[PDB]
Design a protein around this nucleic acid. Structure first.
Ligand SMILES: *[C@@H]1O[C@H](CO)[C@@H](O)[C@H](O)[C@H]1NC(C)=O
Length: 168
RNA sequence: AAAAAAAAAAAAAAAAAAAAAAAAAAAAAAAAAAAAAAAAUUUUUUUUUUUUUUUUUUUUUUUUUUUUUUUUUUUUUUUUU
């Protein structure tokens, strides 16, 4: 099964077909990376409500439900790199007010609309790379008060304009 | 028909590390070899120059014996004109 080993559920390559929810729920770090994940269940995380950070990356996940943000209010690191994520919106990030780290290395998010990060105030580093971005614009209002890293690499931005860079 | 994410295999090529070895070249250390130049203990041989002993040839010198001719100093008994 998973490693556990003092609150670091580093679940390595074990061909886990479904997301497990075992007895050791009193942990803070859980690693779903390198595990067969069809999608993240919005209701299966009730058992593990003490996950300070989670590592669910490289997995094949279609879309993210808003419930995941409210089932785990104490969420700091959201590493979701190398996923499908055909389309995303602000609704899935409504309850993620304590988010501080995000990783998205391959998601093919060509178009971004509205303000997906209106509720993210403590989000420090941003990793939006290799997602086929055509413009660097993220919104029209002023948001992301405390941002230190904005990674936009391997994308297809053609030019930079003052209108699309005024959101910070 | 096309494009991508977890999850398991296999094939060509390039650059690497470790281990078991095997050859070629180069360094010493030992056991020997063939020699052209070397030194040192013993017994012998040839040749040159010199020492000692013995036996003999030639020449020279001293002494003694004997023999033959000359200068001869004398004589006794006689002869002698
Ligand atoms: C949630 O748990 C149920 C019951 O164990 C299971 O049937 C379902 O597949 C799980 N879903 C996810 C997303 O883990």
């Amino acid at each position: 099964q998973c490693t556990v080993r003092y609150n670091v559920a580093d679940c390595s390559h074990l061909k886990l077909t479904h997301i497990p929810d075992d007895l050791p729920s009193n942990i803070t770090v859980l690693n779903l990376t390198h595990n067969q994940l069809r999608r993240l269940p919005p209701t299966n995380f009730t058992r593990y409500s003490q996950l300070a950070i989670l590592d669910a990356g490289f997995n094949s996940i279609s879309k993210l439900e808003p419930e995941l943000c409210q089932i785990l209010p104490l969420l700091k690191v959201l590493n979701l790199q190398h996923n499908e994520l055909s389309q995303i919106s602000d609704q899935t990030f409504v309850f993620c007010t304590n988010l501080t780290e995000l990783d998205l290395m391959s998601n093919s998010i060509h178009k971004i609309k509205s303000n997906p990060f209106k509720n993210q105030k403590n989000l420090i580093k941003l990793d939006l790379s290799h997602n086929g971005l055509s413009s660097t614009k993220l919104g029209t209002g002023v948001q992301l008060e405390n941002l230190q890293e904005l990674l936009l690499a391997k994308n297809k931005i053609l030019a930079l304009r003052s209108e699309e860079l005024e959101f910070l």
